[PDB]
Design a binder for these strands. Structure first.
Ligand SMILES: Nc1nc2c(ncn2[C@@H]2O[C@H](COP(=O)(O)OP(=O)(O)OP(=O)(O)O)[C@@H](O)[C@H]2O)c(=O)[nH]1
Ligand SMILES: [Mg+2]
Lengths: 82, 48, 72, 48, 560, 75, 106, 81, 77, 93, 97
RNA sequence: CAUCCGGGUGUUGUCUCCAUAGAAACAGGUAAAGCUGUCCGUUACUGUGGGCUUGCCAUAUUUUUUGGAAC
């Protein structure tokens, strides 16, 4: 269905994750899976305490993702057409 | 590389005899078609 | 489960609780159960507070939050 | 349903009719389906 | 008004550039992302249907094309969109390299910008095929069922393996088994097996089969392409549990037989059976052909509604047999998304881009992304002006930027000087390749193929395009080799103006010929005559036509 | 090499102890029945909280998702 | 097998639901999906005040209740009222059924 | 091993036969030149049906005498002009 | 490549002693031998002892247990 | 204030401005573009609103104003597993 | 795996032989169970139905739960007539003597 | 460079054959006509019945819907 397809149609753009643990990650979406697993590159990261760091590359399990932020351009991608 | 209907191979080999230095090396029976693929050679000066 | 890029690198691994562990990844499956090597509980400041866990270690996949290829 | 009307301007047949007309037309119909037949015997080669 | 009918059908007015079905700005917005661009070279033998395959992809991308006559909408005549030179229209033949940039979507709904380059199929235009191989990441090798894997296909496979590009094969003109040769379906399955086995004989280690979706079946006259994955997605996936789909897909080829929900690797005893591909794929295609040509229309539309969920309009039901067959097949086989999925799944950059770059340049470490670095593949006559076909291999290029151009014929000595001076140009205009138009843009990015209007005077045949910000960047710079045109020129004409007064015009024109035709060799004798070497008689006919008709526009004597 | 479902099948009519995931609670009782989802029915049970024996109970049904571990007691 | 299809019978009843977080939801039942997703109209949400006053547990529930957009200034005990709500099936603990229902038919 | 529902069957399996009685005629008509590949059209004037034209656009039978051959050639001259 | 469940089996056949970590319950680990393994990673542990989080001195013995897969964080050598 | 027909399903609410609750007590407000089997949601021009602990105590029982914090988010996919309940805020304009 | 009719009869077999048969005995006997819920509430009620997921329509409900006001601790005793109960919230069912 | 024999499409008018429910009751207006308004038939919430553009029909045991919760 459309939301998993939008997360696939987001690959190669910069996305922002928030997790159940309260961490936040922002970076280039290298790969995404139908299970909502994602891999990010050149990742700005943030702790639940609000402390900030940077890391090269990450993988995240789908179940722990709270929401994903996608570039506003995609509202006119061909995915949403009837 | 010559593609021709199989019963007309005598004409093709006659032409390859008329041209100087030309020779036929292999004939491929193109499966499931009436065609043959005939592989050979001819000099460039003779190719006009 | 596209872990192939990591499949013999040193991976740090967030797990349920708040307890980072780390090791050389050795294998994975459809649930993200992971098996990893030279396994260390990363409890804190390394020279006394961490713990080497054993020659083999395997994780039930639901317990992984996230992982990082510190050696790319 | 075969012709637009008595002004007799447009027609539309079925497959059995067109087959029967084609079969009757054997003397005066063309039967050269192979387009390569007209190599150097066509309009533009005559022009050249 | 400038008019171009004497040389090419081309759209001069921006208001008449056709509207895409997709939003075109969205396609540009993903040009920034190298992972979203695939460059596809459509190569294959003479008359394989490559331009027709492109005609399929062009029509499905646009709302209305001004050049569509009703003969083309109804499918009596091919559109031949990319064959847009007057000379190509007259010969019925692709002569020069053309292409289009299209937003394409796979069976999973993910989009790519795809740049397609349509190589000429005639054997004497193999220079253009070499340019296509150089430019392309993946190659669609189009072959027709009838002649199949010929020696030309063998060499195209070999050159593709040499050029480090992903091969994908389109088996075209399946109607010719059904309608021309009139094979019964079992014999047609055996024919396709013979073709696919012959393909595998020359692809050294890599295995090609339909269940791997490296094989696409097509009839670009009747407007359809399909893969096994595409067909089961459209018409069988809804009728089995979703976990079974890929395993059902895996069993639709080879020596597999089926009966009442059970499979075997041998035929069943009590009833004689065809294989699974024949039962589930090929016999339905044969039945679509037969019934669309010869069933009563009301029964036909009832069958199509019950089976394929396609409704026929009243105007479509009035169509003649070949337009109606095309219309029904196009309703059934849905916009070529399984071809885009095959292209998508067959090419992995991780295994190929480094090898391709190391083949076209010297081997070494990766280019720093602070540097612009691009391959100027050829000079092209496109519309009212010449352009340079460029693949951007790294960095960004901006409109109006000042950039340095080195001809590839100097690359070897310059590289030896690297291990132990270049002219510069302003990039006046940049435009996407659009077939019968050029769509202007302000930027071009890594992995993209694009036309560039300013740099064409700094090289003859091909060039390296680069821009740097540090002397250390210059020390790390790689230069592209002179390009391997597959056939050596051995067919010679000696050439002289009819009136010696007109010699300088011929000199300008011969420079233009040497630029535009990649494989041609032009040299001047001490006798004062000009010597042209070409691949063969049609090649010489084409370039001498260009000399007389477009470029020199004078009378020219020639030897036998 | 005894597998989990055969082990619980063997444990029927034996006096087992089950500690829950919550409230530091353990039930000790005779195992009556078990299913594919490892739900438990026990008889003549007793409730222990942190090891203090609250009171004995009749028949008991413990839902599968609540258990931490099951053990056989000394018999 | 049967018991989600029991809930599907209950259309237009003024059922009353307690979510796992502890908030109580009165309203008119328009639909129940096969995944137990329930739709209510003419809905009143509430948190019972003996539970509510322990902030440490009920902060999440209170914050959610206010951010519905339907909490008026507190006449009493943190009531909200809204025309339409969709509730995820997993989130339900209890459904109090209407007192007049003839369960023996179902 | 792998299996699927017992009533699963291919597309268009309810219609038993592949070749209908008219299929041979439809295949013959499909390849014919104009107008026989059509099933609709506009009426033409009777004087606009060039019946004999298709003969001399093609090569004559080689055995024909000289007067016939030059007749073919001259009619081609008229057509080209 | 070693599949994770095959590694669990390689704990099982060699009968090697191992330590197991609970899911969200931080303050305990469990030591013993893996006797049984599963499709859902339920495990049967013999000579089991729970140990706090620090060492074997403070532990208390459990006997033979079935530990339900929903609670396993780690298995370690 | 908005009123929507008793025709029950979420599929009718495409392009309506939803406000969507989650297990952690924030609310996401945006135009619904799509929904899924799992109730994964796509909200365009999205806003997350959240009650900080500094004024969370003002909701305790005793003319009232809460200074809630608001956050901009772009075209959010929301994981259905987290979504607590859904309310409709405005019709498509 | 198995056919639909076989799964139907298998559900009947499981309800009679399996651990769920404690609830079935109370349902058929029309005698009240006691149910410790996940939120430490204890329902006392008569069962009218149940399913695979341990959801259960209840009637004649009484619902004990406890609260504390500083040092003091107090009981609440709500009565309900007819109640659906989602099965995931169930710790442990009893059958009273 | 023209003439001639013919052709397509659109609009409007006219002619021929064949037709009817209706509120075709009334007013405004244009290069034309519901172009526009008052108006009329019934339907928007249900019980019997056809079709699909959907969901259950396929899911309690690791990535969503059968709670690591409760404090
Ligand atoms: N029967 C049949 N004919 C086809 C099919 N596809 C193309 N053709 C015909 O084949 C001829 C060649 O068409 P092109 O599309 O130009 O083929 P090409 O591969 O581009 O050949 P080049 O011009 O040499 O590059 C045309 O007359 C087409 O009508 C097909 O699928 N079936
Ligand atoms: Mg071509």
């Amino acid at each position: 269905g459309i939301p998993v397809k939008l997360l696939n149609e987001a690959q190669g753009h910069i996305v922002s994750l928030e997790l159940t643990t309260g961490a936040t990650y922002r970076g280039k979406l290298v790969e995404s899976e139908d299970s909502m697993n994602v891999q990010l590159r050149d990742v700005i990261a943030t702790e639940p305490q609000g402390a900030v760091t940077h890391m090269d590359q990450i993988f995240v399990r789908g179940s722990q993702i709270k929401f994903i932020v996608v570039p506003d351009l995609l509202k006119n991608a061909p995915l949403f057409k009837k | 590389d010559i593609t021709v209907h199989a019963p007309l191979l005598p004409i093709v080999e006659e032409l390859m005899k008329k041209r100087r230095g030309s020779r036929i090396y292999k004939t491929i029976k193109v499966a499931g078609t009436p065609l043959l693929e005939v592989r050979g050679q001819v000099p460039v000066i003779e190719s006009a | 489960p596209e872990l192939k890029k990591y499949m013999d690198k040193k991976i740090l691994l967030n797990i349920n609780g708040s307890r980072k562990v780390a090791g050389i990844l050795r294998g994975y499956d459809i649930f993200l159960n992971v098996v990893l090597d030279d396994a260390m509980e990363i409890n804190g400041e390394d020279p006394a507070n961490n713990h080497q866990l054993g020659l083999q270690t395997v994780i039930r996949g639901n317990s992984i939050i996230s992982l990082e290829a510190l050696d790319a | 349903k075969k012709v637009n009307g008595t002004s007799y301007k447009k027609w539309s047949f079925d497959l059995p009719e067109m087959s029967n007309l084609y079969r009757l037309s054997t003397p005066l119909r063309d039967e050269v389906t192979d387009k390569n037949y007209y190599y150097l015997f066509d309009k533009k080669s005559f022009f050249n | 008004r400038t008019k171009l009918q004497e040389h090419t059908i081309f759209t001069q007015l921006k208001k008449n550039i056709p509207k895409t079905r997709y939003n075109r700005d969205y396609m540009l917005s993903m040009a920034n992302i190298p992972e979203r661009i695939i460059n596809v070279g459509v190569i294959g033998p003479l008359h394989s249907g490559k331009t027709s395959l492109m005609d399929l992809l062009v029509i499905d991308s646009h709302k209305r094309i001004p050049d569509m006559s009703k003969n083309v909408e109804l499918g009596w005549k091919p559109l031949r969109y990319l064959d847009n030179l007057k000379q190509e229209i007259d010969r019925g033949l692709s002569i020069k390299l053309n292409g289009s940039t299209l937003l394409c979507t796979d069976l999973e709904s993910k989009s790519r910008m795809i740049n397609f380059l349509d190589a000429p199929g005639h054997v004497n235009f193999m220079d253009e095929t070499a340019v296509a191989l150089a430019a392309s990441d993946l190659v669609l090798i189009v072959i027709d069922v009838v002649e199949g894997v010929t020696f030309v296909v063998e060499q195209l496979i070999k050159q593709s393996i040499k050029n480090n590009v992903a091969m994908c094969f389109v088996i075209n003109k399946l109607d010719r088994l059904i309608l021309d040769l009139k094979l019964p379906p079992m014999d047609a399955y055996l024919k396709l097996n013979h073709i696919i086995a012959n393909i595998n004989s020359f692809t050294k280690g890599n295995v090609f089969s339909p269940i791997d979706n490296n094989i696409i079946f097509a009839s670009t006259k009747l407007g359809f392409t399909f893969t096994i994955k595409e067909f089961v997605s459209y018409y069988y996936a809804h009728s089995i549990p979703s976990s079974k789909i890929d395993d059902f897909t895996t069993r639709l080829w080879g020596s597999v037989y089926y009966h009442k929900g059970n499979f075997r690797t041998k035929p069943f005893e009590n009833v004689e059976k065809y294989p699974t591909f024949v039962e589930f794929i090929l016999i339905p295609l044969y039945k679509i052909f037969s019934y669309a040509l010869s069933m009563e229309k009301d029964k036909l539309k009832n069958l199509l509604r019950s089976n394929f969920r396609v409704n026929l309009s009243q105007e479509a039901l009035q169509y003649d047999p070949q337009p109606f067959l095309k219309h029904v097949l196009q309703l059934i086989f849905r916009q070529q998304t399984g071809l885009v999925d095959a292209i998508t799944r067959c090419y992995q950059p991780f295994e190929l881009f480094d090898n391709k770059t190391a083949h076209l340049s010297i081997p070494g470490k990766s280019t720093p992304e602070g540097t612009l670095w691009a391959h100027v593949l050829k000079t092209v006559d496109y519309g009212g002006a010449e352009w340079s076909l460029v693949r951007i291999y790294s960095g960004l290029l901006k409109r109006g930027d000042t950039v340095r151009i080195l001809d590839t014929s100097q690359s070897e000595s310059r590289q030896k000087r690297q291990l132990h001076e270049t002219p510069s140009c302003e990039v006046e205009e940049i435009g996407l390749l659009g077939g019968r138009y050029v769509y202007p843009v302000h930027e071009a990015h890594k992995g993209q193929i694009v036309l560039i209007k300013g740099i064409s005077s700094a090289y003859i045949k091909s060039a390296t395009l680069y821009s740097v910000k540090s002397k250390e960047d210059m020390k790390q710079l790689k230069f592209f080799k002179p390009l391997d045109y597959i056939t050596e020129a051995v067919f010679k004409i000696v050439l002289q103006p009819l009136l010696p007064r007109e010699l300088p015009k011929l000199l300008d024109a011969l420079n233009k010929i040497s630029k535009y035709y990649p494989g041609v060799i032009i040299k001047v004798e001490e006798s004062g005559e000009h010597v042209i070497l070409g691949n063969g008689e049609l090649y010489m006919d084409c370039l001498l036509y260009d000399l007389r008709a477009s470029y020199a526009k004078i009378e020219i004597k020639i030897s036998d | 090499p005894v597998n989990p479902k055969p082990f619980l099948k063997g444990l029927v009519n034996h006096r087992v102890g089950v500690k829950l995931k919550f409230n530091s609670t353990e039930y000790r009782g005779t195992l009556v029945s078990t299913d594919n989802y490892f739900n438990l029915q026990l008889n003549e049970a007793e409730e222990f909280v942190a090891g203090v024996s609250h009171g004995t109970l009749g028949e008991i049904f413990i839902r599968c998702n609540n258990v931490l571990y099951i053990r056989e007691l000394p018999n | 097998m049967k018991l989600v299809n029991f809930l599907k019978k209950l259309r237009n009843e003024q059922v009353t639901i307690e979510l796992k977080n502890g908030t109580t939801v009165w309203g008119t039942l328009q639909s129940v999906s096969p995944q137990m997703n329930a739709i209510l109209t003419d809905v009143k949400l509430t948190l019972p005040q003996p539970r509510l006053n322990k902030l440490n547990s009920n902060g999440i529930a209170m914050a959610s209740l206010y951010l519905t957009g339907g909490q008026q200034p507190t006449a009493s005990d943190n009531i909200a009222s809204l025309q339409y709500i969709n509730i995820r099936g997993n989130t339900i603990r209890q459904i109090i059924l209407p007192d007049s229902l003839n369960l023996d038919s179902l | 091993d792998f299996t699927l529902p017992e009533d699963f069957a291919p597309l268009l399996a309810e219609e038993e036969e592949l070749i209908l009685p008219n299929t041979k005629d439809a295949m013959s008509l499909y390849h014919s030149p104009f107008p026989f590949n059509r099933t609709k059209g506009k009426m033409v004037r009777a004087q606009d049906v060039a019946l004999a034209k298709k003969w001399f656009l093609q090569h004559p039978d080689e055995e024909y005498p000289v007067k016939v051959k030059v007749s073919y050639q001259k009619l081609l001259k008229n057509y080209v002009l | 490549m070693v599949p994770p469940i095959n590694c669990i089996f390689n704990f099982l056949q060699q009968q090697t002693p191992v330590t197991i970590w609970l899911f969200e319950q931080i303050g305990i680990r469990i030591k013993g031998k893996i006797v049984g393994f599963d499709e859902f990673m339920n495990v049967v542990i013999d000579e089991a002892v729970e140990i706090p989080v620090e060492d074997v001195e403070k532990g208390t013995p459990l006997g033979k247990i079935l530990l339900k897969g929903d609670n396993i964080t780690l298995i370690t050598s | 204030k908005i009123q929507v027909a008793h025709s029950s399903r979420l599929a009718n609410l495409i392009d309506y401005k939803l406000r969507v609750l989650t297990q952690d007590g924030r609310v996401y407000i945006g135009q619904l573009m799509a929904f899924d089997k799992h109730m994964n949601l796509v909200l365009n021009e999205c806003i997350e609103e959240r009650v900080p602990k500094t004024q969370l105590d003002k909701l305790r029982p005793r003319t009232l104003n809460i200074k809630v914090e608001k956050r901009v988010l772009g075209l959010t996919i929301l994981r259905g597993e987290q979504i607590l309940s859904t309310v409709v805020e405005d019709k498509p304009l | 795996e198995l056919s639909r009719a076989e799964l139907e009869e298998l559900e009947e077999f499981e309800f009679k032989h399996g651990p769920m048969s404690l609830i079935n005995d109370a349902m058929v006997t029309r005698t009240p169970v006691i149910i410790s819920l996940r939120n430490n509430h204890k329902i006392i009620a008569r069962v009218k139905a149940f399913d695979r997921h341990c959801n259960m329509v209840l009637e004649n409900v009484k619902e004990l739960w406890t609260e504390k006001k500083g040092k003091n601790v107090i009981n609440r005793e709500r009565f309900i007539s007819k109640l659906f109960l989602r099965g995931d919230s169930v710790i442990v069912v009893l059958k009273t003597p």
